[PDB]
Design a protein around this ligand. Structure first.
Ligand SMILES: Cc1cc(COc2ccc([C@]3(C)CCN([C@H](C)C(=O)NO)C3=O)cc2)c2ccccc2n1
Ligand SMILES: [Zn+2]
Length: 261
């Protein structure tokens, strides 16, 4: 405990694809960057005020190091794909990519940039099937799965190179409409939660999945309940415990000193 102030911030590479630029940024850089800057700051407030050990072990947050703004779609040769290409993959007739394949593609395409930052996060605007809002590596119960804060290499047999699992993505479009900013905040918080090591809160542990009359669910709950209840913007005890196991070691590995605001 007692956090290193020279290593308490996970710097992010934030990427806005052409869809986000056009539909959230109104085709303007200022509008695009302002949205992301304010979102990450509000999310940072949640992380910073969180005591991972319920004591004084808090002060860990996130800050943007760079914001890449893709104003137009990535042109590709027949048979070639890129996370910022115009068409969705694998079904170009759908509004969005298969979310898992998009996250994989993003990681592949920005691997070089990702190797130099604590985390890389893609912000897009596409309607993933069945209400999916985001995805991220880390905090997954699945076998052989890994990822999260600090670049972790994975040799892609298909890609023929190393990609890094310190990535995640957020879409601000769901069911044909732009989601509320209060809902966007929760999605990114959730995904970065996986990056920090938390898994979904299980119903089987009432402490980590309270009823609506007890403050509601916490941010790592697998279902988007509302954002209206008091617990929604907080990390449960389960999340805190999981994130506390590796946060210090990870911090020493790739966290940096908070640049002031
Ligand atoms: C808008 C919002 C978001 C959260 C927590 O964040 C998510 C984000 C995505 C999902 C879903 C829809 C479920 C599963 N999912 C993917 C696969 C995922 O879990 N990524 O990490 C999603 O896109 C659920 C909660 C909330 C948590 C508790 C209460 C209200 C909430 N409102
Ligand atoms: Zn999740």
């Amino acid at each position: 405990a007692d956090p290193d102030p020279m290593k308490n911030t996970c710097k992010l590479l934030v990427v806005a694809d052409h869809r986000f630029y056009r539909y959230m940024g109104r085709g303007e850089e200022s509008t695009t960057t302002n949205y992301l800057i304010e979102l990450i700051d509000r999310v940072d407030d949640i992380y910073r005020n969180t005591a991972w050990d319920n004591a004084g072990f808090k002060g860990y947050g996130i800050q943007i190091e760079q914001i890449r703004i893709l104003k137009s779609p990535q042109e590709v040769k027949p048979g070639e794909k890129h996370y910022n290409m115009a068409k969705s993959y694998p079904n170009e007739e759908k509004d969005a990519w298969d979310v898992k394949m998009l996250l994989e593609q993003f990681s592949f395409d920005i691997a070089e940039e990702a190797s130099k930052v604590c985390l890389a996060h893609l912000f897009t605007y596409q309607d993933f099937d069945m209400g999916t809002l985001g995805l991220a590596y880390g905090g997954s119960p699945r076998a052989n799965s890994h990822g999260g804060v600090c670049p972790k290499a994975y040799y892609s047999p298909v890609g023929k190179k190393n990609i890094y699992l310190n990535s995640g993505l957020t879409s601000t479009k769901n069911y044909g409409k732009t989601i509320l900013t209060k809902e966007a905040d929760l999605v990114t918080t959730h995904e970065l939660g996986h990056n920090f090591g938390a898994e979904h809160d299980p119903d089987g542990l009432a402490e980590c999945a309270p009823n609506e009359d007890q403050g509601g669910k916490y941010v790592m709950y697998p279902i988007a309940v509302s954002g209206d209840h008091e617990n929604n913007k907080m990390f449960s005890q389960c999340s805190k415990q999981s994130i506390y196991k590796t946060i210090e070691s990870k911090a020493q590995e790739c966290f940096q000193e908070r640049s002031n605001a």
